[PDB]
Structure formats: C-alpha cells, structure tokens
Point group: D2
Chain length 264, copies 4
C-alpha cells in the first residue's frame, strides 16, 4: 500500500494528503487583538512562557487559501481551495517571541489532515472574508485607503468570530508580519484501554515555512468579537481591545517541521 | 409585511433578497462550446428560435461572485459571496441574436431567489474555479500566457461539468443579451399546467464593466447525472476558453412576451 | 418545454420539483411557546386577525422529512430527504382559529422551491433533531416516558433556535394536533423598474393536506429559545414561556392549495 | 491543558472528541458484493492475507449514526449525528476470518477524528439512505417484505457509490451479521525532513466493540455500483456481482482497541 496520510491505497491517490511539498497561496484578513494575559496564559502548553512584553496580545486571521503539490493540484479547486480561521497568542520560547496557535478552523478535510500532521489543531468550520475585485464597482471594496473588509467564522452552525477592517496605508515592512514563528502541538491519542491519558504523539513543534512571501500588504483599523458557542472555548479569550487591521497575500511551501520537545 | 422577497417581516430584514439595486463583482472562467443544434433547439422556450448561423454554440461560465446592495452588504460574505455555473445557448429573438440560459447553479439561497426573480432558473450546486493570487508562487497560476485554470460544478453530490482553460492572449476590446424565463406555477387543483407567471425576459445590466480579459484554449465536458439534463447538450467540440473580471448592477428587467 | 417549477427542460426532469402529487413522511419535535401578543400581531399579513383567546401562542417544529412523488423518489434520499424548522403563530381568519407561518428554514433546494409554490417562505438553514433508535442503548433516547430530544436550527452559520423536550405520556388526541389550518402567503415580486413594490403574485393561501396521518404521538415538557442573528427576525418573537413539548410522526399528500385573497 | 483529541484546551471542551466511552446507535443499509480477488488483495496491509474461502467478497454499508458519551451528547444532534459509508473486504489474519476496511466516508469532523484514532481511514463525504417511517404512507417504504431502500455516497462532489435493496424476510440469526472482526490501520505520518516515509504511528489494529446489539434485521435482494471519481480508488474494486441486501439497527460502545502489530 502507498500514500502519505490515510487512506493508504494501492495507487496512493485516495489519501487525504500526499507527501510534501505542500504549496500555499492565500489572502489574509487579519486583526490584532488583546485579551486578558491570564486567559492567554491558560492556553499555553508546557514549554512556552507568557510574553514579558505583550502578554495577552494575539492575532486573528481569516484566510482564503489555495493549495497545490507537485502536479498542478490547484486545477482541482473542489479539493485544493479552502478557507481558514485561526488565532495566535503572543508567547515566548526560551526568550524568543513566538506565536502559539490554540484554535483553528477550516472547511476542507484535506486541509484538516494536513493541519493535524503539522500540529495545527484544525476542526471543521465555515469561514468567509470580503474579497477585492480589480474591476471595481459597488460590488467590491477598493484594495487601498478606505476599503472595508468583513470576515466571519462559524463552527457546528454557531458563529464564533466576526471582524471588520478598514485599510489606511501600505505596510512599510511586509516581511516583518511573519516575524514570530508559529508554535503548534502534534497530538494523537491512544485508544487502548488504560492508555487514554498516554497519547502516542505529543510534541511541541515550530512551523517551518519555505520561500515565504508577503505582498499587497495594507494596514488600518479593526473591529473584532469572539462569541460563546457550545463545544468551543474561543470566547474564553475575551477581546478587551482591538489593534490594527491587516490585509495581505501570503505564500509559502511546507516540506519540514521542527520538533521542540517530545513529551512522549 | 415589509420586504422584497419572502419572508416578508415587520422590519424587512429577514427577506432572502431586498429590493434592488443589486451590485455584482465577479471573476469568470468560461468556455465556448458547440453541441448538437437540435439539442440546443429542444431547450428553447416559446418566443425563441434557433440561430440561423451558430445553432449549437453555447458558453459555459463558472463565476466567483460577490454581491452587495445599498448598505455594504459585501461586509457579510457569509451571505453575499457565492459561486455560480451557468450555460447559455445561441438563439434568435425576433431575428436578433441572443443567449438563452436553460440551466444555472449557485451555492447560495439568496442568489437562488434573486435569480428566480430575474428568470434565471437557479438550482443549488457546488461550484469551484482555480483562483489567481498576485503574490505568485507554486500555489497559484499566473494570469497571462500559459496560465491554467480548472473549474467544476456538481449538483446533489453529482459532478455535472468539468473544465480547464489555458490562457494565450489578452483581449483588448472586451455581445448577446441574456434571455431568461420568469416562471412561477400554480398549485390550486386543476391549474398545475397554468402558471401564474410565465414570461420571456431580457436581462438588463447597468454600468457593465469587464477587465483583465484573456482568451486561450479550453477543455470541457458535461457529465450525465440523475435529475439533471445538462449532459443532453454534449460538448462535441470546444472553442475559446476565457478569463475576466465582470461587474454590473441590476435595477430593471425587460419583459418581452407574457405567455401567462 | 416540460416541467412544473424551473428549470423547464425537454424531458421535465431537471425541474426542482415536478407537478404534484407530493408525498411526505416525517418525524416532528415540537414545542408550544408563548411570545408577546404585539410581536405576533406585527408579523400577521393583511387578512388575518389576532387570536382573541391565545394571542402570542405559537408552535416551533423541527421535522425530519422524506418526500416522494409518483416514482418512488424516496429511493433517492440525496434529493428527497430534508430537515425543516418552522414556527406558526395562533391567529384568526374571519373568526376561525388558524396558524400563520412567518418563518421556515430547510436544507434542500427542491423543498425550498416546493415551499415557495405553497407560500411557505423557506430559506436555507441547518436543522437537526435527536433521533430514537429501536435497538436502544446509550446512544439513543427511548421513544416513551423520560425520553429526551434536542433540536437546533441555524441560518447562514448563525444559531437561531435551540430546543429540548422530555416525553411524559401519549398525546390524548393525536388527530387534534393538526386542528389549526396553516396560513401562508404566495409572493413573487416584479423586477421591472417602477414595479418593485407591485408583486406579480401576492395572495393569502390556506395549506391543503390530503390523507393526513399522525402516529406515535407523545407529549411532555419543553425548553425553547430563539437567538438573535444578522439577517433574521425570529428572535423578535422572544420565548417568554414554553408550553408542552411534542414528538410524533406526520404524513400527508399535497395536490391542492386554497387561495383566500389575491392582493396583487 | 485538558482534552483527548486536539484542540487541547483549558476546559477540555473544545476537543473534537472527548475520551471514551463512545456510544453508537445506527441504522444500516448493507450490501454484500463480490469484486476481483486480486483487486481486494491489493488493498490488504501486511499481516493480512486473502481469505481462502471468500476472497473478493465485501460488504458495503450506509449508516445513519447517532453518537453519545457520558453526558447525553445525543441531545446536540448538530454535532452528534452523522452519516457514514464504508466497505469491508473479507480477509484472513493468522488463519482467522476478518474484515478489512480500506475506505470509509463520514459527514462530520468529530466522527472523522474518532475514526482516525480507531484506525478507520475516514474522509469527508455526503452519505444518504432511504428512511422508514412508522406512520407509513406513500412517502416511506415499509420496514418489511417489499420495502425498497436507496443509498448513495459522494466525495468532493463526486458520486462514488449507489445502492438499492428490496427486503424479503427477517434475518434468521441477527447476531451473526457482526461475526467478522474489523481490522484497521492506525497511521499518523511524520513531517520532519527526511522522515516523510517513517510514520510516527503505523500499526495494525482490531476493532473492539462493547455490548454489540442488532435489531429489526431484514434481508433481501440488492443492486450496487461503485463509480470512478478523481482522488478516489473505490471503483478500483469493481462490483462483479451483488449478494444479499440487509437492513438493521446496530448499537455498540467503544472503550478499547487491540494493537496487533507495530510497523513503525
Ligand atoms: C493547514 C493549515 C496550514 C497553516 C497555515 C498557516 C496560517 C498562518 C501562519 N502564520 O504564520 O501566520 C502560518 C501557516 C493546511 O491545510 O496545511
Ligand atoms: C443570480 C444570478 C444573476 C446574474 C448572473 C449572470 C450570469 C451571466 C451574465 N452574462 O452576461 O454572461 C449575466 C448575469 C443573482 O444572484 O442575481
Ligand atoms: C416545503 C414544506 C412543506 C410543509 C410542511 C408542513 C409543516 C407543518 C404543517 N403543519 O400543519 O403544521 C404542515 C406542513 C416542501 O418541501 O413542501
Ligand atoms: C467513526 C466510525 C466508527 C466505526 C463504525 C463501524 C462500522 C462498521 C462496523 N462493523 O463491524 O461492520 C463497526 C464499526 C466514529 O465516528 O467512531
Ligand atoms: K467600490
Ligand atoms: K505559479
Ligand atoms: K437509552
Ligand atoms: K408506503
């Protein structure tokens, strides 16, 4: 049998995701927000410490992704396109600023599988963001000063996040938006009786992104709210204040992943 | 009892679609195709006749739409964004070349309702098209020569159309009006064959704009499916593939013939 | 061209719904509720009167439907099965008790089309109800005393209703559950400039059901809440108090519809 | 951090699936089928061998599931109800008859996660089956002689299986329907460079079902077809002949899993 993820199969096609490289091109609506430092700290895994300078700061990102591998998979958009909502929280790893990801939602099963392999704790959700069309007109915002963009995320039919940004000026240092590495947790439990508290995989990891590119980056103001929902804990990170709003394209390739600590 | 479409309500908010103006901005992946003239003619309503020059020609379009009205509704993409697959067939209306729309599919209930009001016979479906990102890289095609775009449409979990285009040249000067049929039946016993609304209409588009248009080669197939008839217009050969942005506003509709 | 609803076609197959008869078999989770009489009155169309005895009373129903016509269409569950959430409000039509339906949600486009033809103002939604399995065990409630059933409805990814019932005893008079006729409003607007306020169809109608049958009818206690949501007005009929909860099978055939008053 | 599957969280609620017990109640439309012995053998993992008596035989199952755990989770059908399509293939393990599961599809993210933990190689799909209603009438088949039931499965908008059964008589020995234990493969790859062919988890497992129960079991005739689809390999198991069709309720609890061989 062949394949990278399940299902393994005779021809290695049925698997949810093939082996890397995984290529990504996306458009991001992002919102800087600030929650209670203690609430953010409660989500951190062992190995990460509160950020001494910006504890409580986080970033909420709504992304329209397009994925591809080595065979022009982006020509099959029914499988390759997906929409994603995640938050990261400022933290430190041994004195270095990092971005811990506690929650993330996608509308695609292949994306969910790729995320689990990376340690992104992906669940299914419905994610939407306003789109900018270059033809212009009253059906689209301008990708420039004054342009307004909305974004929402739902899980199991429940709205969990709603955001709006208003662009003001270009980002001076676009590459700096990706300065903090994302930290994740690869986790796969055991089902054998007596071992439900002894996961087979449980390791802190740092996301490794090849050939990262950011373009058409804009910054402005933002409004954001997290909403309580049954079976979710996002709203346990209350939005006390919103920072800047961001809009940019993002691209990278995934071929690697750094294990920081293997907790068995 | 305020509102434009149902549900009517005390505040006029719950309705699937409010009154026009309806604004649209979209990106189109399309394929010119040719089917059997007799098959195309079989779909034509009363009032339309076969095209004496291009009978059998049609256009398949996959569109990523964004809608808005008078209140920045595009800030609510969960309701305002939708994806659409339709075909048009060359025909004549009183000697004038037109484009008849027999089938169209969308993934949004508000778009379905707006379409019914326009005479677009919209059903629900799953529609996807490759997207071009300006950042570039291996996760996206590049708009321009050699850029490849795929598109698909499904209905009730059944794939009904698959397409791919390869762009070759830009179009410097970016023509048939779309003809639709407003149709709303009666349920009163004895009147199931006497629709309350049954009228040929011409789509009216305000402030139409097309940008960044490209043409190239194309592959297209319609697939047989239960409860669908699209594949009864088999693709005997393809013409040009094309890619462009499209914008217009809807405020009006032209009644051509009332068959009720 | 052939067909009943659009699209009309050479074979009359592609249409969203064929001509009647339309057959229905369903399982209902229902909740009697009481809202503000003035709020219920605000939703009533011209021609209906507030109920002089039970103004403000309504019924919320979550239904798992199976539809069929003359050709065993229920063998195609991808098209024929759908789930439905609606409310009715007590009202009077010329001194006779009736049930006005202001809002209804389904997860199926064919059902939406059939609804519009009937005057049910259907929109898309996600509807779910707990199901009872004869095999029993910890994965199912019992269809009998003590059985608990939950139900929810969402629209555009927003939760608009959450309900729970606990069964106590059989319904004393099952047939009486369908005593109030449902009143609807067939409505189809015009798009020609200058006529956006002059609908082509605008007529009050009474639902006509053939061969109505109820079975396995139970009654008990109930909890219900409507939730505010963007683009919805259901929560403007707040649940001030809940009445009885109901669980029953329902079946009927649709071949007819009674026009009460034509207004445009 | 609390939780069984990802996401781990402060309160242990956001996780896709909590720790077992997992309770299941479902209604199965099943079809016995026969494919090419060599095609079935091509899907078998190491440790399984062709069945010396019935190589090529399989069972296609369409199931309407309801899940619960220790807190009446079936009162939240938006999360707890899901629909499932799978096939099993007759095989042998060390001379014992077993049922290997190469492919399986569900319409719920929690179900997909639970399956991965069990070694069920679940992907997202759309699955439907005709339902029998006690009220009867033209909208439902009879759960008895002559009752006809349809079932379908799609993946990424592509139909991959269509089936129909006609019931004839009760199953003589209902408990015998679950005689072959199911064999699965727990599999979780590595993303670290150089280790994309060295999965972290890769083990043959046998499904352990507690308190298995079958009821309302019927048998009859069947028709079945697998359809080719991009990104799938189900149709590489062509249906040369269909055997009997089955309709029954099924219930069990999952608390355990038996590791047969660790191939990591
Ligand atoms: C699943 C998700 C891939 C991860 C996407 C992602 C989001 C945000 C950052 N970031 O650094 O802000 C990085 C990666 C998949 O389908 O791979
Ligand atoms: C429903 C759809 C209305 C607009 C669709 C459309 C498609 C193609 C052309 N065309 O000129 O080729 C024009 C209009 C809605 O949501 O309004
Ligand atoms: C659309 C809806 C059909 C109507 C269902 C219905 C609900 C409730 C009652 N009632 O008397 O309480 C009657 C009928 C369709 O798909 O037809
Ligand atoms: C995922 C799936 C659970 C497994 C279901 C299943 C199907 C068939 C048999 N069988 O023995 O034929 C056993 C179990 C989940 O959501 O757990
Ligand atoms: K604009
Ligand atoms: K490229
Ligand atoms: K029970
Ligand atoms: K029957």
């Amino acid at each position: 049998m062949k394949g990278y993820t399940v299902p393994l199969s005779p021809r290695g096609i049925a698997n949810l995701a093939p082996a890397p490289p995984w290529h990504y091109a996306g458009t991001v609506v992002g919102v800087e927000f600030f929650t209670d430092p203690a609430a953010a700290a409660a989500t951190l895994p062992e190995g990460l410490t509160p950020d001494p300078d910006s504890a409580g700061r986080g970033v909420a990102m709504f992304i329209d992704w397009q994925y591809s591998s080595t065979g022009l998979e982006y020509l099959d958009p029914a499988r390759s396109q997906y929409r994603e909502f995640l938050i990261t929280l400022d933290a430190h790893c041994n004195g270095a600023p990092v971005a811990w990801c506690p929650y993330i939602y996608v509308d695609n099963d292949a994306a969910m599988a790729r995320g689990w392999v990376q340690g992104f704790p992906k669940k299914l959700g419905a994610v939407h963001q306003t789109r900018a069309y270059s033809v212009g007109g009253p059906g689209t915002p301008v990708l420039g000063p004054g342009g307004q963009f909305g974004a929402t995320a739902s899980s199991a039919g429940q709205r969990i996040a709603e955001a709006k940004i208003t662009l003001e000026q270009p980002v001076p240092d676009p590459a700096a938006l990706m300065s903090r590495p994302v930290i994740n947790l690869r986790h796969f439990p055991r089902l054998a009786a007596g071992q439900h508290d002894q996961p087979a995989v449980h390791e802190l990891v740092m996301s490794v992104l090849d050939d990262t590119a950011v373009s058409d980056a804009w910054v402005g103001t933002a409004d954001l709210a997290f909403l309580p929902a049954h079976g979710e804990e996002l709203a346990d990170l209350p939005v006390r204040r919103t920072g800047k709003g961001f809009h940019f394209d993002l691209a990278f390739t995934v071929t690697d992943l750094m294990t920081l600590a293997d907790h068995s």
